[PDB]
Design an enzyme around this catalytic site. Structure first.
Site, mmCIF file in Angstrom:
data_model
loop_
_atom_site.group_PDB
_atom_site.id
_atom_site.type_symbol
_atom_site.label_atom_id
_atom_site.label_comp_id
_atom_site.label_asym_id
_atom_site.label_seq_id
_atom_site.Cartn_x
_atom_site.Cartn_y
_atom_site.Cartn_z
ATOM 1 N N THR A 103 7.666 49.611 26.324
ATOM 2 C CA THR A 103 7.560 49.882 27.789
ATOM 3 C C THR A 103 6.141 49.784 28.306
ATOM 4 O O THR A 103 5.175 50.162 27.623
ATOM 5 C CB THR A 103 8.129 51.259 28.146
ATOM 6 N N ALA B 24 14.536 57.512 27.122
ATOM 7 C CA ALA B 24 15.330 57.106 28.270
ATOM 8 C C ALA B 24 16.024 58.320 28.894
ATOM 9 O O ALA B 24 15.749 58.675 30.040
ATOM 10 C CB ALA B 24 16.334 56.035 27.876
HETATM 11 C C1 LIG Z 1 11.791 54.965 29.095
HETATM 12 C C2 LIG Z 1 12.637 53.997 28.286
HETATM 13 C C3 LIG Z 1 13.866 53.596 29.101
HETATM 14 C C4 LIG Z 1 11.768 52.798 27.947
HETATM 15 C C5 LIG Z 1 11.270 52.608 26.507
HETATM 16 N N1 LIG Z 1 11.792 53.589 25.585
HETATM 17 C C6 LIG Z 1 12.602 53.155 24.642
HETATM 18 O O1 LIG Z 1 12.951 51.974 24.589
HETATM 19 C C7 LIG Z 1 13.095 54.179 23.661
HETATM 20 C C8 LIG Z 1 12.394 53.963 22.320
HETATM 21 C C9 LIG Z 1 10.887 53.847 22.495
HETATM 22 C C10 LIG Z 1 10.230 52.638 22.226
HETATM 23 C C11 LIG Z 1 8.841 52.529 22.390
HETATM 24 C C12 LIG Z 1 8.100 53.621 22.832
HETATM 25 C C13 LIG Z 1 8.747 54.829 23.111
HETATM 26 C C14 LIG Z 1 10.133 54.939 22.942
HETATM 27 N N2 LIG Z 1 14.496 53.870 23.489
HETATM 28 C C15 LIG Z 1 15.432 54.609 24.066
HETATM 29 O O2 LIG Z 1 15.142 55.597 24.723
HETATM 30 C C16 LIG Z 1 16.860 54.185 23.895
HETATM 31 C C17 LIG Z 1 17.864 54.749 24.674
HETATM 32 N N3 LIG Z 1 19.127 54.333 24.517
HETATM 33 C C18 LIG Z 1 19.440 53.377 23.624
HETATM 34 C C19 LIG Z 1 18.435 52.801 22.848
HETATM 35 N N4 LIG Z 1 17.170 53.215 23.010
HETATM 36 B B1 LIG Z 1 9.681 52.728 26.322
HETATM 37 O O3 LIG Z 1 8.934 53.899 26.959
HETATM 38 O O4 LIG Z 1 8.908 51.747 25.429
#
Ligand SMILES: CC(C)C[C@H](NC(=O)[C@H](Cc1ccccc1)NC(=O)c1cnccn1)B(O)O
Lengths: 242, 241, 198, 233, 244, 212, 204, 250
Positions: F1, F49
Site C-alpha cells: 500500500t 484492511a
Molecule cells: C489497508 C489495506 C486494505 C491495504 C494493504 N494491506 C494489506 O494488503 C494487508 C496486508 C499488508 C501488506 C503490506 C503492509 C501491511 C499489510 N492485507 C489485508 O489486510 C488483507 C485483507 N483481506 C484479505 C487479504 N488481505 B497495505 O497497507 O499494504
C-alpha cells in the site's frame, strides 16, 4: 408511601397518568402529514420579553429524515433525543441504510417504561416516567411520510395530524375538520400556523412560534424566522380574502 | 443500595421536590446578569444576617469555569459547589478531546443536563440551585448569557436575575433594557447592573459585588471602591430631580 | 531515542527538544514540538514510546489546568513535579505502563528561582542544574560538567546549549532535525525562533 | 379494608387476595376485544383494533413469535411487547440449541413462570395484559389464554377484553361445529369473525378496523390487515 | 417492603429547606459554645466543655479541640462521635495531599473537602447528616492565618472571629463590638475568654470547663506552633485575664 | 500500500493505490482505500484492511453524531482525535493501521492529520503512508511547491502513487484521486496502473529503464 | 533486568556506646551513566531514621509512605513512633506487597526515647526483619560492606570513634563498587543530638 | 431477600434529639449497675452477676471480658449486644493494630475503635444503635493506667471513677465522697465493693459479684518463659475466693 409502578383500581399506572397531566400544561405542538412532507410547529412561549426566544429549542433533528417536536417537561426530552439520534446513527452503522421512522419511534418508546425502584424483568433505573410527549416526523422508502405521537406510557400512535400540549383538545377538533388526503405542504404550513394562532394566549408572530418540515428531497429543516414571517403575512391575507 | 424515587409526579402532574428546589433558589441571595454590546456583567448581593467575615478567604459568588466562562447562582451554596466542580472538570475534558474550549451554550447544556438527571434518578434530590452562566465562545467577540434551573431547563437572556426579590429587579431590567441600543460600554453596562441591585439591596457598597467578562478570557472582579463610585454617582442622579 | 535536554541558569530554565518524528524507515516530520505548557510558569518536555508520549503529556496538562481553575492559583514547580512523579510511579505497576521520560522546567514565583526536574518512566525524580533523557546525556553531561556555572545568564545558557547540540550533531548516529528551544523565567514561557542559525 | 392491602404485589389481603394482580386484570377488561379458536388443522386469531382519533392509526394487536407461533393482546401494549419478545427468544433458543420448534404448551409454561416472578417480589409490578397464543407444533393446533396472574389455559376457543363475554358464549355454543372446520382456513376465520361480532356494540368491523391471524398444518403464522381482510367483512 | 419505614432524610420541605439539616442545626445549638478569633500574629480557639463532674479526668480528656495537621486544627460543636468520623477522614486527606504535591494542604482545600462530604449526606444515600459544626483554625503560605466554619449543610465561610454551638447570637454580637483588625493574639485570647464568660449557662467560668488552643508563628523561628493548653495553663491564663 | 496527502495553494490532494495482499497472494486490485467520512472529510487506509475499514466507518458515525449534537461541522482536529483516542484504548491488542484524516473547515483551513495504531497523531502538510511510502516521498519531495496548480498537484499525486505501484510489490492496481476545497472533496477518477504506466512513460519520457 | 541494580547505592548502620550511626552514598545512576550525586538515601520520622537502597522510584515512594503513616500515628498516639515499633510498621508494610514487592533494602536506626537503648535493623524486600546488636548493611556493595564491617567493627565505640569506623566501612566498600559512591553522608545519632557530615571521596 | 433497608433508622427529630440513641440510653438505665475506679497502680471494674435462674450456672456467663492482655471491659444494658461488641473489639485490636505495629493498642485507641463501631450503628442503613454502655479499663506503657466510658452514640470520656446502669446516680455520688488521687489498688477494690453493695438486693458474695483488675504484670499467667520482655498480662479476673476474702474486711 406507594410504589412508583402501582396500578389504580381502574387498571392504570398512577405515575403514567399523572405524567400525562404534566404534558397538558406544556406548550402546544402540532404536526401535519401530507404526500409532500410533514410539517411540525410549536409555540415557543417565552416567560419574559428578556428571554432570547430563538434559544427555545422544541423542534429538534434526529437524523436527516427524522425530526421531532416536544411538549411538557422539555428538559426530560434531552436524553430521549440523545437515544433517538444514537439509534438512528447506530442503525446506519450496522445496516448501511436509514432507520425506518416506525422503528425509531419504537426504540424511543422502549425507554419510556424503564422506570421504577427495581422491577423484576430485566434493569429499570429511572425514578419516574418522562414528563414530555413527542411528535416524531419523517420519511422512509417503505411507509413514506409519517407522524407519530410518542407518550410516556410507551405507546405510540400514527397520526395524519396531531396536537399535544395545553391547547391540544381544541386544536385536535380543528384538525379533525381541516385535514384531507389531497393537503399540499404549503396548505399544511398555513394550517399549523392558523391552529396555533387560535389556541395561543400571545399574538402569534415569527418569534413566539416555529415551523419546520421534513421532505424526502431536502430532509428535515427548521424554517428560519424570516421564512415563517412571510407565511404568517400570507395566512392573514387569505383569512381577510374571506 | 439507596434508590428511593424522591422526585415523583403528584396527581396534578407536578414534581414537588423540583418545585421545592425552586423555593430554595427564591431564598438565595439575588443574582443578576446583563449583556452589553461587547461584554457581560454579573452582579450578586451579599447578605447581612451576620457580619465579621473574612472577605479574602470566603468563597466568592462568581466562579470561573474556564478562563473565558463564569458561573453565578442562587440557592444552596453547598449544592452549587457540586455543579461548579463537574463543570470545571467537563471544561478540561472538552479541551482535551475537542482541542477547543467549550462554548457558553455547550457548558450551559452540560450543567443543565446534570441538574435534570438529579430529577429522575433513584435516591437523590434535585439541586436547590439556579445558575447564570456567562462568557464568550472561543475566537467570538458576541457576548453570551444563559440561565439554568433545578428542573434542568436552560435558555439565553439579554438580561436576567434570580433569587430573593428577583421579581423586583426583573421589573427594573424589563422597563430599562433596550435590545436596540445593549449598553454600548463596559461602564454603562456595570452601571445598569448596580442600579438593578439597588432596587433590592437597600444600601450597598460592601453589599454588592460585580464581575466583568470581556472577550478573549479577560475576566476581572471590581473592588469595593470601584463599585462604590458607581453607587455614589447613581444616587446623585436621584437627588438632581 | 529523541533528544531531550534541559539547563537551569541564573534566572531561567532552558529546554531543548529534537524536532524529528521518525517511524521505522522514514522521517515523518521535522518540526515536532515535544513540549506542553502545564501552567504559565511551568513547562514539560517528553520522550518515549510513540502514543504514550503525547497522551501522558496532555493528561498531565489537563490536570494542572484543572487545579489552576479550582484554586485560582499556580502550583509551584516542586508541586507539579511531585504530582507527575506519582502518576508515573502508579503507571509502572499497572497493566500497561506509560513509557515516557520527562523534563520539568519551572520558574517558582514565590522563592524567584528557576527549577529543573528530571523524571523517568519509573517515576524516578531528581532536581538538577542540567539533565537529559536517553542517549543525549552520554554526549552532553561531560560538556556541561566542564562549561556549566550556576550564575550563567540566559544568553550564556543558550551558548552552552548550542555547544551541546553541535556535539550531538557531530557524534550521534541519528538525524534528529535540530531542536526547538524554550525559556522559562519570571515573565512566563517563550520560544527562541532563531536557533536554526544563532 | 381494600385500601390497606392494595399498595403492592407483596401484600396478601385478609381473604387471601392480591389486589395489585386484580388491578392488572382490570386493564385487560378495558382493552379492545380479541378472539382465538382452532380446529385440528388450523388456529385463528381475530382482533378488533382500536384507534385514538379518526386521524390516528388502528393500534396493532397481533404479534408473531416464530414461524409456528404468535399471539394477540388485550391491555397494556408495551407489556405485550416485553412478553412477546421473551417468547420470541425462547422460541429462538429452542431452535438454535436443540433444532426444535418450541411446544406451544411449553411456551405456555414459560409465560406463566415469567409473569409469576412479578407477583411475589417488591418493587416489581404485575403485567397488565392478557394474551391469546396460537400455534402449530408436533401435536397439532393449539390455543392458549394467558392471564397476568400467571394462569395459562389451553382451550379450543376464547375471547378477552371489553364485552368479550359475548363471543365466549358464542364459541361455547358453536364448539361442536368449528372444531371440525379441518382443511378449510376461510371457514375457520369466518367462524372467528362471527365470534368477534358477538362482542360489537359501539360501532361495525371495517377494513382498517380488522386484524386476523392464522397458523396450521402447512401454513406459517401470517398477519392479515386492511384490504387483505376485506373478503371477511 | 422497606419504603414504609424510610424517614427520607434528603428531601426538601415545601419552603425549600432541608429538614434533617435544620434539626441537626437545632441539636448543635445546645452544644458547648466554641469560639474562634484570628489576629494578625496568630489564631485562638476556645470552647466550653458541656456537662462536667469531679471524677472526669481532664488531663486525658479531649472533646472539642482536635489537631488535623501540624498547621490546621478544629473546634467541635455537636456529636463528638460524628465529629471523630469526619476528623479522621480530614487527617487522611491532608496526608494524601502532602504525598501528592510534597506541600502541606492549603487550609481551604481541606475545609472544602470536609464540607463536600457533609453536603453529600444532604443529597443522596438516605442517611442522617453528621450532627457537627466545625471551626477551622489554620495557617498556610498563601492566605497566612485563616478561620473557617462548616455545618451539617456542607456550607462553609471565612471569619475574623466566630462562634458555634449555644448562644452564638449573643457571642457574635459581643465579638462584633470588641474585635479590631489590628488585634494581637494576646488580645484575642482575652476576647475569647470574656465572650464565653459572658454567654456560660453555668454559675462561674472555671478552668475545668474549658479547652484552649493557639496557632502562633512563635517571631523567633522564621515557622508556625499549635499549643493545646494543658489544664494548669488554662487556670493560669484565666487568672491573668481577670476572671480567676 | 501507498497513500499520500499533501497541502498546497489549492487545498488538499489525496492519492491512494488499491492493492491488498495476503503474503505474496494478491487478494484484490480494487480496494477502495479512501473513505468518504462526510462531504468535507476524507480518511485513508493503510495496514489491516478490516481495522481501517471498520474504525473509519465508525468514525463517520461519531462525526455525524457530533453535528446533530453541536449543530455544526466537526473539526479536522476533533475528528482525528476521536479515531486517535479510540485506537489508543486498544494499544498492544494488535490493531494495525496507518491512517490519514484530511478535511477543510473554515475555522482550520486545509488540514491533514496522521493517525496510527501506535497512537501517534501528527498535523502536517505532506504525508505518505504504507509499504510503498518511501517511493512516493522521492517523487513528491522533489516536485512539491506550495504554488502548484490544482492540475499539477493532482498529477504529482497520481504520479507519486505510480512510482510506488511500480517498485513496491505490495502496492498497485489503480490510483484513486481526490481534491479537497472548502466547498468539500471532489473525486478525480480511478486510474488503472496497467494503462496509466504506458501513458505516463510515453508522454513523460520517464521509466526509461523498462522495455516498452 | 535486576531492579536492585539499575540505580545503584549503599546504606550501612552501626551501634556504639549510647549512640547509633547510619550512612549512605549519594549516587543515583542509570546503569553505567551517573545521573545525580545528591541523592540521599537516609530519611527521618521524628527521632527514627530510615535508609533505603534499591530502585530509586521505590526509595522515594516508601519515604513518602512512611512519612504519611508516621504522621497519622503521631496524631492518634500523641507521641513520636519508636524504632522498635517503626521496624514492625516497615515489615508489615513490605509484606503487604508480598507478590508485587518494592525493590528496596530498608535500614532502621535510632535510640529508644524511653529506654536510651541503641537500635538498628535491616529488612529484605518483603519485610523479613534482621535485628542485629552490631551492624546492618544494604545495597549493591553489601558484600564489600559485610567484609569491611566484619573486620573494622568493635562494640561500645564512642560517637567520635564510631564515626571514623562507619565512614571507613562505607568509603572502602563503595570504592570497590561501580554503582556506589559519588559522595557520602553519615549521621551520628545520640538521646540528645544528631550530627550530619558529608565525606570527601573519589568522584569516579 | 436482600437488605433493602439502606436508609438511616436513627434520624433527627424537630427538637434535635436522636431518638434511638436516647431510647438505647434508656435501655442502659434498666441494666444492672456496673462501675470502674482508677487507683494509682491499677484500675478495677466491677458488676453484679444477676443470674436469670438458680438452675443456670452463673460462671458460664462472664460480664467482665478481657480485650487484650492489658485491657478489660464491662457493661450495663443488653448482654447480647455487649457480647458481639467484645468479639469485634478483640478482632479490631488485631486487624487494625497488632498485625500492623506488632504490639497491642493503647487503651484510648482501642476505645476509639469500639466507639467508631458504635457510632456507625447510629448512622448506617438498616440498623439500630447498640443498647449498651461500656466501661473499658486498661494499661499501656506511655499513657499508664486508664478508665473510659462508651455510650450508644459512640461518645467516650475518660474517668477517675464512675458507674453506669440502674443505681448510677447514687453510686456516682458515693464515689465522689470516697475518691482521692492517692488510692492504692486494694483501697479501690474496697471502694468498689462498698459502692456495689448499695445497688445489690439479694446475696452479696464472690458468686453473685464479678470483679476484675488491671494491675501488675502476671508472669505466672503468661504460659511460657524465656523472653525477658514478656513480663504476663496486667488484666486479672478475681476469683470467687479472692472476693470473699475482701468481704470479711468490709
Ligand atoms: C489497508 C489495506 C486494505 C491495504 C494493504 N494491506 C494489506 O494488503 C494487508 C496486508 C499488508 C501488506 C503490506 C503492509 C501491511 C499489510 N492485507 C489485508 O489486510 C488483507 C485483507 N483481506 C484479505 C487479504 N488481505 B497495505 O497497507 O499494504
Amino acid at each position: 408511601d406507594r410504589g412508583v409502578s402501582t396500578f389504580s383500581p381502574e387498571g392504570r399506572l398512577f405515575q403514567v397518568e399523572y405524567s400525562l397531566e404534566a404534558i397538558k400544561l406544556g406548550s402546544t405542538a402540532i404536526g401535519i402529514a401530507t404526500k409532500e412532507g410533514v410539517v411540525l410547529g410549536v409555540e415557543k412561549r417565552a416567560t419574559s420579553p428578556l428571554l432570547e426566544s430563538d434559544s427555545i429549542e422544541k423542534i429538534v433533528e434526529i437524523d436527516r429524515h427524522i425530526g421531532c417536536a416536544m411538549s411538557g417537561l422539555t428538559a426530560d426530552a434531552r436524553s430521549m433525543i440523545e437515544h433517538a439520534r444514537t439509534a438512528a446513527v447506530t442503525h446506519n452503522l450496522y445496516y448501511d441504510e436509514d432507520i425506518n421512522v416506525e422503528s425509531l419511534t419504537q426504540s424511543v418508546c422502549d425507554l419510556a417504561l424503564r422506570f421504577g425502584e427495581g422491577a423484576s424483568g430485566e434493569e429499570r433505573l429511572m425514578s419516574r416516567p418522562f414528563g414530555v410527549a413527542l411528535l416524531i416526523a419523517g420519511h422512509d422508502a417503505d411507509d413514506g411520510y409519517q407522524l407519530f405521537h410518542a407518550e410516556p406510557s410507551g405507546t405510540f400512535y400514527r397520526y395524519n395530524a396531531k396536537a399535544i400540549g395545553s391547547g391540544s383538545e381544541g386544536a385536535q377538533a380543528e384538525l379533525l375538520n381541516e385535514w384531507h388526503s389531497s393537503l399540499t405542504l404549503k396548505e399544511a404550513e398555513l394550517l399549523v400556523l392558523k391552529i396555533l394562532k387560535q389556541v395561543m394566549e400571545e399574538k402569534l408572530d415569527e418569534n413566539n412560534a416555529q415551523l419546520s418540515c421534513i421532505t424526502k428531497q431536502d430532509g428535515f429543516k427548521i424554517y428560519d424566522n424570516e421564512k415563517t414571517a412571510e407565511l404568517i403575512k400570507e395566512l392573514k391575507e387569505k383569512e381577510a380574502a374571506e | 443500595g439507596y434508590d428511593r424515587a424522591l422526585s415523583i409526579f403528584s396527581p396534578d402532574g407536578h414534581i414537588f421536590q423540583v418545585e421545592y428546589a425552586l423555593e430554595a433558589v427564591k431564598r438565595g441571595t439575588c443574582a443578576v446578569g446583563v449583556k452589553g454590546k461587547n461584554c457581560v456583567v454579573l452582579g450578586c448581593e451579599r447578605r447581612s444576617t451576620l457580619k465579621l467575615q473574612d472577605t479574602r478567604i470566603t468563597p466568592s459568588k462568581v466562579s470561573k469555569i474556564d478562563s473565558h466562562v463564569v458561573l453565578s447562582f442562587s440557592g444552596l451554596n453547598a449544592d452549587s459547589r457540586i455543579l461548579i466542580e463537574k463543570a470545571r472538570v467537563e471544561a478540561q475534558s472538552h479541551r482535551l478531546t475537542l482541542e477547543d474550549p467549550v462554548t457558553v451554550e455547550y457548558l450551559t447544556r452540560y450543567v443543565a443536563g446534570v441538574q435534570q438527571r438529579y430529577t429522575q434518578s433513584g435516591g437523590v434530590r434535585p439541586f436547590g440551585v439556579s445558575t447564570l452562566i456567562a462568557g464568550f465562545d472561543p475566537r467570538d467577540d458576541e457576548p453570551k448569557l444563559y440561565q439554568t434551573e433545578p428542573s434542568g431547563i436552560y435558555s439565553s437572556w439579554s438580561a436576567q436575575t434570580i433569587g430573593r426579590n428577583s421579581k423586583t429587579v426583573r421589573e427594573f431590567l424589563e422597563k430599562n433594557y433596550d435590545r436596540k441600543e445593549p449598553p454600548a460600554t463596559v461602564e454603562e453596562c456595570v452601571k445598569l447592573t448596580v442600579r438593578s441591585l439597588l432596587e433590592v439591596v437597600q444600601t450597598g457598597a460592601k453589599n454588592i459585588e460585580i464581575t466583568v467578562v470581556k472577550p478573549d478570557s479577560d475576566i476581572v472582579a471590581l473592588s469595593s471602591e470601584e463599585i462604590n463610585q458607581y453607587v455614589t454617582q447613581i444616587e446623585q442622579e436621584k437627588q438632581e430631580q | 531515542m529523541d533528544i531531550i535536554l534541559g539547563i537551569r541558569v541564573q534566572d531561567s530554565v532552558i529546554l531543548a527538544s529534537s524536532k524529528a518524528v521518525t517511524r521505522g524507515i522514514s522521517v515523518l516530520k521535522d518540526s515536532d514540538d515535544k513540549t506542553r505548557q502545564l501552567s504559565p510558569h511551568t513547562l514539560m518536555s517528553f520522550a518515549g514510546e510513540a502514543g504514550d508520549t503525547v497522551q501522558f503529556a496532555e493528561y498531565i496538562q489537563a490536570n494542572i489546568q484543572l487545579y489552576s481553575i479550582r484554586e485560582d492559583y499556580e502550583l509551584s514547580p516542586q508541586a507539579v513535579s511531585s504530582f507527575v512523579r506519582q502518576e508515573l510511579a502508579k503507571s509502572i505497576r499497572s497493566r500497561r505502563p506509560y513509557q515516557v521520560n520527562v523534563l520539568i522546567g519551572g520558574y517558582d514565583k514565590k522563592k524567584n528561582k528557576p527549577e529543573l526536574y528530571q523524571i523517568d518512566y519509573l517515576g524516578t525524580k531528581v532536581e538538577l542544574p542540567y539533565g537529559a533523557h536517553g542517549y543525549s546525556g552520554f554526549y552532553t553531561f561531560s560538556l556541561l560538567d566542564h562549561h556549566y556555572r550556576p550564575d550563567m545568564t540566559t544568553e550564556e545558557g543558550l551558548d552552552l546549549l548550542k555547544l551541546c547540540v553541535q556535539e550531538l550533531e557531530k557524534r550521534m548516529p541519528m538525524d534528529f532535525k535540530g531542536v526547538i528551544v524554550k525559556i522559562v523565567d519570571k515573565d512566563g514561557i517563550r520560544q527562541v525562533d532563531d536557533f536554526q542559525a544563532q | 379494608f381494600r385500601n390497606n392491602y392494595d399498595g403492592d404485589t407483596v401484600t396478601f389481603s385478609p381473604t387471601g387476595r392480591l389486589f395489585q394482580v386484580e388491578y392488572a386484570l382490570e386493564a385487560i377488561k378495558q382493552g379492545s376485544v380479541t378472539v382465538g379458536l382452532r380446529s385440528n388443522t388450523h388456529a385463528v386469531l381475530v382482533a378488533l383494533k382500536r384507534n385514538a382519533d379518526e386521524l390516528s392509526s388502528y393500534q396493532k394487536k397481533i404479534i408473531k413469535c416464530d414461524e409456528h407461533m404468535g399471539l394477540s393482546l388485550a391491555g397494556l401494549a408495551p407489556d405485550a411487547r416485553v412478553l412477546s419478545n421473551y417468547l420470541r427468544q425462547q422460541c429462538n433458543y429452542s431452535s438454535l440449541v436443540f433444532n426444535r420448534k418450541l411446544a406451544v404448551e411449553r411456551a405456555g409454561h414459560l409465560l406463566c413462570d415469567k409473569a409469576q416472578k412479578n407477583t411475589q417480589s417488591y418493587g416489581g409490578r404485575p403485567y397488565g395484559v392478557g394474551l391469546l397464543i396460537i400455534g402449530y407444533d408436533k401435536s397439532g393446533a393449539h390455543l392458549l389464554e394467558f392471564q397476568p396472574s400467571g394462569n395459562v389455559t389451553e382451550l379450543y376457543g376464547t375471547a378477552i377484553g371489553a364485552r368479550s363475554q359475548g363471543a365466549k358464549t358464542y364459541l361455547e355454543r358453536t364448539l361442536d361445529t368449528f372444531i371440525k372446520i379441518d382443511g378449510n382456513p376461510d371457514e375457520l376465520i369466518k367462524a372467528g369473525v362471527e365470534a368477534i361480532s358477538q362482542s360489537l356494540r359501539d360501532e361495525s368491523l371495517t377494513v382498517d378496523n380488522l386484524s386476523i391471524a392464522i397458523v396450521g398444518k402447512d401454513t406459517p403464522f401470517t398477519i392479515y390487515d386492511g384490504e387483505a381482510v376485506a373478503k371477511y367483512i | 417492603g422497606s419504603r414504609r419505614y424510610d424517614s427520607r432524610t434528603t428531601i426538601f420541605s415545601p419552603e425549600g429547606r432541608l429538614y434533617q439539616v435544620e434539626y441537626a442545626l437545632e441539636s448543635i445549638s445546645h452544644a458547648g459554645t466554641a469560639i474562634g478569633i484570628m489576629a494578625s500574629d496568630g489564631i485562638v480557639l476556645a470552647a466550653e466543655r458541656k456537662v462536667t463532674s469531679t471524677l472526669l479526668e481532664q488531663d486525658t480528656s479531649t472533646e472539642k479541640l482536635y489537631k488535623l495537621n501540624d498547621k490546621i486544627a478544629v473546634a467541635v460543636a455537636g456529636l463528638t462521635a460524628d465529629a471523630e468520623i469526619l476528623i479522621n477522614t480530614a487527617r487522611i486527606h491532608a496526608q494524601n495531599y502532602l504525598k501528592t504535591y510534597n506541600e502541606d494542604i492549603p487550609v481551604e482545600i481541606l475545609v472544602r473537602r470536609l464540607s463536600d462530604i457533609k453536603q453529600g449526606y444532604t443529597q443522596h444515600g438516605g442517611l442522617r447528616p453528621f450532627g457537627v459544626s466545625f471551626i477551622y483554625a489554620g495557617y498556610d503560605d498563601r492566605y497566612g492565618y485563616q478561620l473557617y466554619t462548616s455545618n451539617p449543610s456542607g456550607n462553609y465561610t471565612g471569619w475574623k472571629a466566630i462562634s458555634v454551638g449555644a448562644n452564638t447570637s449573643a457571642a457574635q454580637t459581643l465579638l462584633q463590638m470588641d474585635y479590631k483588625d489590628d488585634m494581637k493574639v494576646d488580645d484575642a485570647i482575652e476576647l475569647a475568654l470574656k465572650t464565653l464568660s459572658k454567654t456560660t449557662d453555668s454559675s462561674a467560668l472555671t478552668y475545668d470547663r474549658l479547652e484552649f488552643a493557639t496557632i502562633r508563628k512563635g517571631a523567633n523561628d522564621g515557622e508556625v506552633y499549635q499549643k493545646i493548653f494543658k489544664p494548669q495553663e488554662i487556670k493560669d491564663i484565666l487568672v491573668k485575664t481577670g476572671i480567676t | 500500500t501507498t497513500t499520500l496527502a499533501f497541502r498546497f495553494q489549492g487545498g488538499i490532494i489525496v492519492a491512494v493505490d488499491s492493492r491488498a495482499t495476503a503474503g505474496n497472494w494478491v487478494a484484490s486490485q480494487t480496494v477502495k482505500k479512501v473513505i468518504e467520512i462526510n462531504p468535507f472529510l476524507l480518511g485513508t487506509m493503510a495496514g489491516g484492511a478490516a481495522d481501517c475499514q471498520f474504525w473509519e466507518t465508525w468514525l463517520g458515525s461519531q462525526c455525524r453524531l457530533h453535528e446533530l449534537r453541536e449543530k455544526e461541522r466537526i473539526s479536522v482536529a476533533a475528528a482525528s482525535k476521536i479515531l486517535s483516542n479510540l485506537v489508543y484504548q486498544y494499544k498492544g491488542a494488535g490493531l494495525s493501521m496507518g491512517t490519514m484524516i484530511c478535511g477543510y473547515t473554515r475555522k482550520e483551513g486545509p488540514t491533514i492529520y496522521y493517525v496510527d495504531s501506535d497512537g501517534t497523531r501528527l498535523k502536517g502538510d505532506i504525508f505518505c503512508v504504507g509499504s510503498g511510502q518511501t517511493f512516493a516521498y522521492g517523487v513528491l519531495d522533489s516536485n512539491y511547491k506550495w504554488d502548484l496548480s490544482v492540475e499539477d498537484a493532482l498529477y504529482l499525486g497520481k504520479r507519486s502513487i505510480l512510482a510506488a505501484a511500480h517498485r513496491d510489490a505490495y502496492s498497485g492496481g489503480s490510483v484513486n484521486l481526490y481534491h479537497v476545497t472548502e466547498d468539500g472533496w471532489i473525486y478525480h477518477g480511478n486510474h488503472d496502473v496497467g494503462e496509466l504506466f504506458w501513458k505516463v512513460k510515453e508522454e513523460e519520457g520517464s521509466f526509461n529503464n523498462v522495455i516498452g | 533486568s535486576d531492579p536492585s541494580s539499575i540505580n545503584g547505592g549503599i546504606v550501612v548502620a552501626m551501634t556504639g556506646k549510647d549512640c547509633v550511626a547510619i550512612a549512605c552514598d549519594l549516587r543515583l545512576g542509570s546503569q553505567s551513566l551517573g545521573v545525580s550525586n545528591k541523592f540521599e538515601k537516609i530519611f527521618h520520622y521524628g527521632h527514627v531514621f530510615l535508609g533505603i537502597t534499591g530502585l530509586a522510584t521505590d526509595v522515594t515512594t516508601l519515604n513518602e509512605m512512611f512519612r504519611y503513616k508516621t504522621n497519622l500515628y503521631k496524631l492518634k498516639e500523641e507521641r513520636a513512633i519508636e524504632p522498635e515499633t517503626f521496624t514492625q510498621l516497615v515489615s508489615s508494610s513490605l509484606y503487604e506487597r508480598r507478590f508485587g514487592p518494592y525493590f528496596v533494602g530498608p535500614v532502621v536506626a535510632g535510640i529508644n526515647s524511653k529506654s536510651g537503648k541503641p537500635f538498628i535493623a535491616g529488612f529484605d524486600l518483603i519485610g523479613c526483619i534482621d535485628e542485629a546488636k552490631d551492624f546492618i548493611v544494604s545495597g549493591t556493595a553489601s558484600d564489600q560492606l559485610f567484609g569491611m564491617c566484619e573486620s573494622l567493627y568493635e562494640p561500645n565505640l564512642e560517637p567520635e570513634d564510631l564515626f571514623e569506623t562507619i565512614s571507613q566501612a562505607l568509603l572502602n566498600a563503595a570504592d570497590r563498587d561501580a554503582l556506589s559512591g559519588w559522595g557520602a553522608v553519615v549521621y551520628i545519632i545520640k538521646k540528645d543530638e544528631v550530627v550530619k557530615r558529608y565525606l570527601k571521596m573519589r568522584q569516579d | 431477600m436482600t437488605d433493602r433497608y439502606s436508609f438511616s433508622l436513627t434520624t433527627f427529630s424537630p427538637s434535635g434529639k436522636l431518638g434511638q440513641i436516647d431510647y438505647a440510653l434508656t435501655a442502659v438505665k434498666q441494666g444492672v449497675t456496673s462501675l470502674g475506679i482508677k487507683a494509682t497502680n491499677g484500675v478495677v471494674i466491677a458488676t453484679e452477676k444477676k443470674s436469670s435462674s438458680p438452675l443456670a450456672m452463673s460462671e458460664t456467663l462472664s460480664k467482665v471480658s478481657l480485650l487484650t492482655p492489658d485491657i478489660g471491659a464491662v457493661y450495663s444494658g443488653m448482654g447480647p449486644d455487649y457480647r458481639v461488641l467484645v468479639d469485634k473489639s478483640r478482632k479490631v485490636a488485631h486487624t487494625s493494630y497488632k498485625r500492623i505495629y506488632g504490639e497491642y493498642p493503647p487503651t484510648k485507641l482501642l476505645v476509639s475503635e469500639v466507639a467508631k463501631i458504635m457510632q456507625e450503628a447510629t448512622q448506617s442503613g438498616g440498623v439500630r444503635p447498640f443498647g449498651v454502655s461500656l466501661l473499658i479499663a486498661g494499661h499501656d506503657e506511655f499513657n499508664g493506667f486508664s478508665l473510659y466510658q462508651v455510650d450508644p452514640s459512640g461518645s467516650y470520656f475518660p474517668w477517675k471513677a464512675t458507674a453506669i446502669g440502674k443505681g448510677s446516680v447514687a453510686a456516682k455520688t458515693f464515689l465522689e465522697k470516697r475518691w482521692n488521687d492517692e488510692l492504692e489498688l486494694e483501697d479501690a477494690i474496697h471502694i468498689a465493693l462498698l459502692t456495689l453493695k448499695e445497688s445489690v438486693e439479694g446475696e452479696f458474695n464472690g458468686d453473685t459479684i464479678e470483679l476484675a483488675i488491671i494491675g501488675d504484670e502476671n508472669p505466672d499467667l503468661l504460659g511460657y518463659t524465656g523472653i525477658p520482655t514478656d513480663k504476663g498480662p496486667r488484666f486479672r479476673k478475681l476469683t470467687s475466693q479472692e472476693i470473699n476474702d475482701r468481704l470479711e474486711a468490709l
